[PDB]
């Protein structure tokens, strides 16, 4: 269950718990503020030294 | 200078800010820790557990996601986390088991995704003990 | 019999030295339970039962050496 | 009786050495409660009661070796 | 036989001193399991089994020195 | 009486060895109070009182072994 | 032979004191494996094998002093 | 008197062994003050006074066993 | 020769007590390697080799005191 | 005088055992100063002076037991 | 000569007990180097050389007490 | 002279036991320097010099008890 071994950064270690918690509550007391708070549509792309780039992927 | 000023804030909402507290109980990596008025400056990493702010009056207890805790020399503890959780009237046993069980099936799914499942198991199990 | 009788008392006072293993031994085993709950108050009905198991294991040295003294005073 | 009587005093002074287990033993058990409460003041009425339980367990070595001395001075 | 018989009791009370290794020894081995499970409740059915293995290893010193006392009281 | 009288002094000098439990024992118990309040000076009127309680518990080994010496010099 | 025979039993009960190194020794070596896996569950098939190697090294003191007792009771 | 006089010197050299409790004991008590102020320079006039109190408590074992030697050399 | 022969067995059983340094000694040296590879698995082929070097250093006390027993049983 | 003279040498070699309190004792007291300044070089002219004070306190056990040997070799 | 010759073997088996300081002593000194590189591998050619210096210092107790045994078996 | 001469060897083998304070003592003092640099290499020419000072303080117990053996073998 190592997180800093083959898991993710400490930022992600608390992240998984943030969504798990926010999703472990009542569905009635779950404002839309929390919904979009766990939603993201950002993609990253690695570039080279010659303006080159890698295949786009989801964060 | 009497008491200790608490600063419990989140990336979406701030609860306490320069407020005097009698005692606080927040889980640390090394182990469960407590703080009072005058306390030695310690900087420990907070793990997914349960925090409780104490007052002369009945003390409230909220569930924390995790982060860091630092007690400033000038008698000032600062708690930083992501999400927060009220007493028990917020979480539901039924809403937890649904995903909880699905987590054990994530180990069955590809490891890339099962890696995060192992981390969920722990947090979820602790949620059950909060029911008390 | 007099010379051999005197050795019964000398040997009984030395067999008590072997009981240190139960004094300091059980101390450490029990002390861990005290320092464990301070680091994790959650787990209690899991470490407490096993802690008692360690007691009977360390109590052994406090029984054997204890019987040796009786086998030299009220035994022989 | 003289040679066997002398062994009663020699054996009594050695049975006191076995009482070290209660001096250092109970020390560690009690010391853990001090290092525990200074790290988690909340859990007091939980570690304090069990701490006393460890006392009687470590006090054993301080009773057995204590009785051995009386069985050589006021007993025999 | 009288002078050699007396040495049977003196040697039996000293062989009990060698049993300290089992009192304090097994204590540390068992104490580690308590400090471990109070820091990592996940791994239980992995450290518990090996912990017992360490018991029989440290129980050795508590058996050999224990047999030596019988070979001087009920043996010879 | 001469041979038995000599054993009164030999047994008295050995019963002082049992007082090590009070020297090192009380040391650890008191040392914990020093390290405890070094990390949390606020809690004081809670660990200080219990610390004294541990003193009388560890002082036991320093009284029993102390009385044994008087029962061989000014007692018998 | 009687005076020299008696020394065979006295010397055998003292050679058991040397077995403390195996009781407390192996305890610490095994205890480290318990405190290592509870803090690093990842590495197991690496520390476990070497841990056993330390056993045979500390078991030495528990064999030599063990043979000395047989060379005074069933040897000589 | 000659046989009983010789026991006065043998018993005096053994009562010095009981002074180990003051050497190692006071050491730990004083050592805690050193490891306390190096981690919390703030508090000083609070741990220093109590530290001295622990001295007289651990100095006890260094006085009793010290008087026993004089009661066998310059006393009796 | 009989009185001097008996001292050969008494002295051999005491020279085994000096072997405690190898039991507990090598234990601590090996235990450090276990505690070291739990917080830093990276450094292995650096601490492992030096760890063995510490073995031969602590094994010294387990050889000298071991030879002394043979110089009283199969030597003299 | 011959039997009582021999006890002067036997008692002198035992009073040296009480000097362990100064060897290990002063060691811990001085060792704390080393682990202290490292973790906090800021405080030096505050812990250094008190550290020396602990020396004379632990040096006591190394003086009393030291004088006992002279009162059996060059005293009596 | 027979009574004085026997004391040569008894005194040689006791001088081996003083070699514990080299077994456990060198162990701690070497163990620190292991726990040190695991915390800071950056500093190696600085702590390693001084570590060896501590060896010869602790090896002293393992040489003096070692020579005492030869001065009673192959010396006198 | 024969009975008193034999006590010269018995007392010399016991005075070596007092040298444990230098083996384990100097070990802890030197070990602190190793664990101190692993946490803060900034302070080297400050802790190193004082570390040597602690050596001569702990070396005391290794000199006094060392001289006692010569005053029973090459002295008297």
Residue of chain A whose alpha carbon sits nearest to that of B119 = A1
- Using an 8 Å CB-CB cutoff, list chain J residues near H38: 35-37, 39-40, 43, 47
What is the separation, in whole angstroms, between the first and last Cα of chain H? 13
> Which of K5, K27, K69 lies nearest to residue I25, judging by beta carbons?
K27
Please give the Cα distance from K55 to K31 (Å, whole number). 12
Q: For K40, phi and psi rounded to 5 degrees?
A: -155, 80
Instruction: Using alpha carbons, list the distances in angstroms from residue D65 to C72, F11, H61.
Output: 14, 15, 19
Which residues, including other chains, have CB under 8 Å from residue A42's CB and lie 6 or more apart?
A58, A59
Please give the Cα distance from J73 to J11 (Å, whole number). 9
Rg (CA), chain C: 18
- E 39-68 residues with CB < 8 A to B: 39, 42
B84-85 and B76-80 beta bridge pairing = unpaired
Please give the Cα distance from L68 to L8 (Å, whole number). 11
Rg (CA), chain H: 18
> Which of C8, C11, C22 lies nearest to residue D21, judging by beta carbons?
C22
Touch between E and C (at least 3 CB pairs under 8 Å): yes
Q: Find, among B50, B25, B45, the residue nearest to B35 by Cα.
A: B25
Please give the Cα distance from J32 to K61 (Å, whole number). 23
Q: Is the distance from CB of L54 to CB of L27 less than 8 angstroms? A: no
Please give the Cα distance from D54 to C63 (Å, whole number). 17
How far away is chain B from the Cα of C37, in angstroms, using its nearest Cα?
A: 9
Q: Which two tokens stand for residue L37?
A: 């640099």
Which fold does the domain A1-59 belong to in CATH?
Atp Synthase Epsilon Chain; Chain: I; (1.10.1620)
Q: In which residue are the tokens 């456990």 written?
A: K24
Q: Find, among C49, D44, D29, E38, the residue nearest to B27 by Cα.
A: E38
Q: Is the distance from CB of K1 to CB of L1 less than 8 angstroms? A: no
CA dihedral F57, J21, C29, I34 (to 10 degrees): 160
Please give the Cα distance from C24 to C22 (Å, whole number). 6
How far away is chain B from the Cα of F58, in angstroms, using its nearest Cα?
A: 29
Q: Find, among B57, I16, L50, the residue nearest to J31 by Cα.
A: L50
β strands within chain L, DSSP E: none
The residues that bridge with B71 in the sheet, in sequence order, are: B77
Q: Is the distance from CB of E39 to CB of C43 less than 8 angstroms? A: no
Please give the Cα distance from H24 to J21 (Å, whole number). 5
B76-80 and B4-9 beta bridge pairing = parallel
For residue F3, count other CB atoms closer than 10 A to its CB. Answer: 13
Please give the Cα distance from K9 to I11 (Å, whole number). 5
Touch between B and A (at least 3 CB pairs under 8 Å): yes
Q: Across the beta sheet with B60-64, what order do the strands follow? A: B32-35, B23-27, B50-54, B60-64, B84-85
CA angle F4–F10–F15, rounded 5-degree value: 120
B76 three-state secondary structure? strand
Q: Is the distance from CB of D59 to CB of D19 less than 8 angstroms? A: no
Please give the Cα distance from L55 to K57 (Å, whole number). 9
For residue B81, count other CB atoms closer than 10 A to its CB. Answer: 25
Q: In which residue are the tokens 């890696």 written?
A: B115
Q: Find, among I34, I67, D19, H60, the residue nearest to G26 by Cα.
A: I34
Q: Find, among F61, F67, F68, the residue nearest to F25 by Cα.
A: F61
Please give the Cα distance from L16 to K22 (Å, whole number). 12
Please give the Cα distance from C62 to C59 (Å, whole number). 5
CA dihedral sign, ordered A49, A50, A54, A58:
positive
| CATH 1.10.150.530 correct for J1-76 | no
- Using an 8 Å CB-CB cutoff, list chain C residues near B32: 38-41
Ordered DSSP codes for chain K: --HHHHHHHHHHHHTTGGGHHHHHHHHHHHHHHHHHHTT-TT--TTHHHHHHHHHHHHSSHHHHHHHHHHHHHTT-
How far away is chain H from the Cα of B9, in angstroms, using its nearest Cα?
A: 28
CA dihedral sign, ordered G73, I23, I60, L7:
negative
> Which of K2, K5, K31 lies nearest to residue I28, judging by beta carbons?
K31
Please give the Cα distance from A27 to I28 (Å, whole number). 56
Burial class (CB in 10 A: 0-12, 13-18, 19+), B113: exposed
- Using an 8 Å CB-CB cutoff, list chain A residues near G42: 2, 5
Q: Is the distance from CB of G57 to CB of I30 less than 8 angstroms? A: yes
Please give the Cα distance from L57 to L51 (Å, whole number). 10
Q: Find, among E50, E29, E64, J23, the residue nearest to I27 by Cα.
A: E29
Please give the Cα distance from L22 to J62 (Å, whole number). 12
Q: In which residue are the tokens 């999703």 written?
A: A23
Q: Is the distance from CB of C39 to CB of E38 less than 8 angstroms? A: yes
Ordered DSSP codes for C11-45: HHHHTTGGGHHHHHHHHHHHHHHHHHHTT-SS--T
Please give the Cα distance from B85 to B51 (Å, whole number). 10
Mutate to test the interface with A, among G37, G38, G39, G42 (most CBs of A within 10 A): G42
Burial class (CB in 10 A: 0-12, 13-18, 19+), I11: buried
Which residues, including other chains, have CB under 8 Å from residue A2's CB and lie 6 or more apart?
G41, G42
Which residues, including other chains, have CB under 8 Å from residue A13's CB and lie 6 or more apart?
A3, A4, A7, B66, B119
Please give the Cα distance from A19 to B48 (Å, whole number). 12
**Resolution number, Å:** 3.4
Instruction: Using alpha carbons, list the distances in angstroms from residue B61 to B44, B53, C24, H30, J38.
Output: 20, 6, 40, 40, 39
Q: Which two tokens stand for residue G51?
A: 């841990």
Q: Is the distance from CB of I23 to CB of G62 less than 8 angstroms? A: yes
Q: Is the distance from CB of L13 to CB of K11 less than 8 angstroms? A: yes
H or E segment at B84? strand B84-85
Please give the Cα distance from E25 to E19 (Å, whole number). 10
Please give the Cα distance from B25 to B39 (Å, whole number). 13
- Using an 8 Å CB-CB cutoff, list chain C residues near E64: none
User: Could you tell me the residue ranges of all domains in chain D?
Assistant: 1-76
Residue of chain B whose alpha carbon sits nearest to that of D39 = B33
Which residues, including other chains, have CB under 8 Å from residue C72's CB and lie 6 or more apart?
C8, C9, C11, C12, C15, E9, E12, E13
- Using an 8 Å CB-CB cutoff, list chain C residues near B126: 42
Q: In which residue are the tokens 């029973």 written?
A: L72
3-state SS string for chain I: CCHHHHHHHHHHHHCCHHHHHHHHHHHHHHHHHHHHHHHCCCCCCCHHHHHHHHHHHHCCHHHHHHHHHHHHHCCC
**Orientation of helix H3-14 relative to helix J61-73, angle to 10°:** 160
Q: In which residue are the tokens 């569950």 written?
A: G41
The residues that bridge with H27 in the sheet, in sequence order, are: none
Q: Is the distance from CB of I40 to CB of L38 less than 8 angstroms? A: no
**Orientation of helix F20-36 relative to helix H47-58, angle to 10°:** 170
For residue B86, count other CB atoms closer than 10 A to its CB. Answer: 13
Q: Which two tokens stand for residue D22?
A: 């209660």
């Amino acid at each position: 269950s190592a997180w800093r071994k083959a898991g993710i950064s400490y930022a992600a270690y608390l992240n998984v718990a943030a969504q798990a918690i926010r999703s472990s509550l009542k569905t009635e007391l779950q404002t839309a503020s929390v919904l979009n708070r766990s939603q993201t549509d950002a993609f990253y792309t690695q570039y080279k030294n010659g303006t080159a780039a890698s295949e786009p992927t989801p964060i | 200078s009497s008491g200790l000023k608490l600063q419990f804030a989140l990336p979406h909402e701030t609860l306490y800010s320069g407020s005097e507290v009698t005692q606080v109980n927040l889980p640390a990596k090394s182990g469960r820790i407590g703080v009072l008025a005058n306390h030695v400056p310690t900087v420990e990493q907070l793990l997914p557990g349960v925090v409780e702010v104490m007052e002369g009056s009945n003390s409230k207890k909220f569930f924390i996601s995790g982060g860091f805790a630092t007690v400033q020399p000038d008698s000032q503890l600062c708690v930083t986390a992501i999400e927060a959780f009220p007493l028990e009237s917020f979480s539901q046993e039924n809403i937890k088991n649904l995903l909880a069980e699905a987590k054990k099936n994530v180990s069955s799914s590809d490891a890339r995704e099962a890696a995060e499942a192992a981390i969920q198991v722990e947090v979820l199990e602790n949620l059950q003990s909060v029911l008390k | 019999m007099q010379l051999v009788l005197a050795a019964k008392y000398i040997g009984a006072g030395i067999s008590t030295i072997g009981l240190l293993g139960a004094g300091i031994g059980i101390a450490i085993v029990f002390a861990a339970l005290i320092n464990g709950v301070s680091r994790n108050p959650s787990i209690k009905d899991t470490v407490f039962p096993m802690a008692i198991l360690g007691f009977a294991l360390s109590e052994a040295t406090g029984l054997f050496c204890l019987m040796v003294s009786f086998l030299l005073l009220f035994g022989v």
